[PDB]
Amino acid sequence: DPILLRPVDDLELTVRSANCLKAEAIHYIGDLVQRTEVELLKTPNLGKKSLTEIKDVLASRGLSLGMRLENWP
Amino acid sequence: FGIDMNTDYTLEEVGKQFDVTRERIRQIEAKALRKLRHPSRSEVLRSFLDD
């Protein structure tokens, strides 16, 4: 997949999740489909409705958590 | 703007319809304008600009 180095607002996500992702410094797409559910959860002020946010936002293009890709960049 | 209506109301005039003092109307314009700034939201319109 060639797109995967796009920052935060590629996915049209909420200031809850965006605030938490810029706190995590997770902006590129190869890094957000790396870690799974509780791995994404353990940062503060994020929970299961933001987990449904993450689930629907990556089911809106069909990739899932488990693409722990290397040599990037 | 004047999209299927022959004005182009101003910031207070749109805020006159909803009784908002033109500040949230300006923000919700800038919120929706930032909402249309994204890729895979502006994938047809960015091509409509002469580049």
Q: What domain count does chain A have?
A: 1
Per the rule left: phi > 0, alpha: psi between -120 and 50, beta: everything else, A70 is beta
What sign does the CA torsion over A60, A43, A27, B33 have?
Answer: positive
- Tell me, what CATH number does A50's domain have? 1.10.150.20
Residue A33 domain boundaries: 1-73
Distance CA A43, CA A2 (A): 28
Q: Check whether the bond before B8 is cis (ω within 30° of 0).
A: yes
Q: Name B7's Cβ contacts closer than 8 Å, sequence gap at least 6.
A: none
Q: Do B38 and A12 touch (CB under 8 A)?
A: yes
Tokens of residue B29, six digits: 């314009």
Run of H or E residues at A45: none
Structural method: cryo-EM
Resolution in A: 3.5
Measured between CB atoms, does B41 come within 8 Å of chain A?
Answer: yes
Measured between CB atoms, does A9 come within 8 Å of chain B?
Answer: yes
Let me know: does B22 contact B15? Beta carbons within 8 Å: yes
The letter for the amino acid at A23 is A
